[PDB]
Amino acid sequence: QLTEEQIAEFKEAFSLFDKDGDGTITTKELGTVMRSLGQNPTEAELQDMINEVDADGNGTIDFPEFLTMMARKMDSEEEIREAFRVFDKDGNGYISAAELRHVMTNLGEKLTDEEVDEMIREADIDGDGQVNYEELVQMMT
Amino acid sequence: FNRQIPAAASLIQTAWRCYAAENPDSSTWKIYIRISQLREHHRATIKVIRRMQYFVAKKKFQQAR
Numbered sequence: 001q002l003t004e005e006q007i008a009e010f011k012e013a014f015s016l017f018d019k020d021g022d023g024t025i026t027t028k029e030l031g032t033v034m035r036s037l038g039q040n041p042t043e044a045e046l047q048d049m050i051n052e053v054d055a056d057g058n059g060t061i062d063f064p065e066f067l068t069m070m071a072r073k074m075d076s077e078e079e080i081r082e083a084f085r086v087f088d089k090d091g092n093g094y095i096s097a098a099e100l101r102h103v104m105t106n107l108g109e110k111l112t113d114e115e116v117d118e119m120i121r122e123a124d125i126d127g128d129g130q131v132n133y134e135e136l137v138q139m140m141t
Numbered sequence: 142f143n144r145q146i147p148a149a150a151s152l153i154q155t156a157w158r159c160y161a162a163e164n165p166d167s168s169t170w171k172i173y174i175r176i177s178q179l180r181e182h183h184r185a186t187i188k189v190i191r192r193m194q195y196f197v198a199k200k201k202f203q204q205a206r
């Protein structure tokens with residue numbers, strides 16, 4: 001299924017990034033949007049974001065490349081699963097809510113406590129603080 | 142000391158933040174402090190930005206391995 005209401009929404013979404021109207025998203029325009037939202041990204045971050053979507057390597061993002069990027073779904077579930085394993089010390093398939101919150105809020109992108117709560121509230125099964133992270137891999141996919 | 146530990150974290154957070162954003166009422170929306178009120182044009186660009194960040198965090202994880 002290749003939706004059509006979605007193409008419209010994506011058209012509108014592309015426009016917010018392509019201030020020009022020249023049919024192209026450049027890193028400058030992408031940092032313009034991010035900075036307006038309160039983010040201070042580095043051009044290494046901006047270029048990495050363009051590189052992931054710029055499928056023809058010409059250094060910018062045109063609308064069909066945008067479409068591809070939005071049109072993707074998530075198997076990326078084994079990479080996420082492997083990501084969790086890096087923190088499953090016991091190899092049990094579990095991470096303690098205390099350890100989850102600790103690595104989530106202090107490494108990488110640094111989630112907020114409420115954000116982490118939503119994770120814990122979503123995948124506890126047993127209400128004893130043992131986060132079944134296969135349930136998360138499953139919820140996000 | 143394990144370049145995978147930071148990358149694995151960023152893959153989970155960005156994947157989660159990408160998933161959580163489909164809920165308009167998730168607490169993951171509360172982080173944009175410097176916005177006086179989230180309009181729906183903010184949400185469109187945030188969804189796009191968060192999908193890009195996940196792709197970057199996806200690739201960075203595979204590279205550390």
Ligand SMILES: [Ca+2]
Nearest residue numbers: 018020024025
């Ligand atoms: Ca442009």
Ligand SMILES: [Ca+2]
Nearest residue numbers: 054060061062
């Ligand atoms: Ca291009």
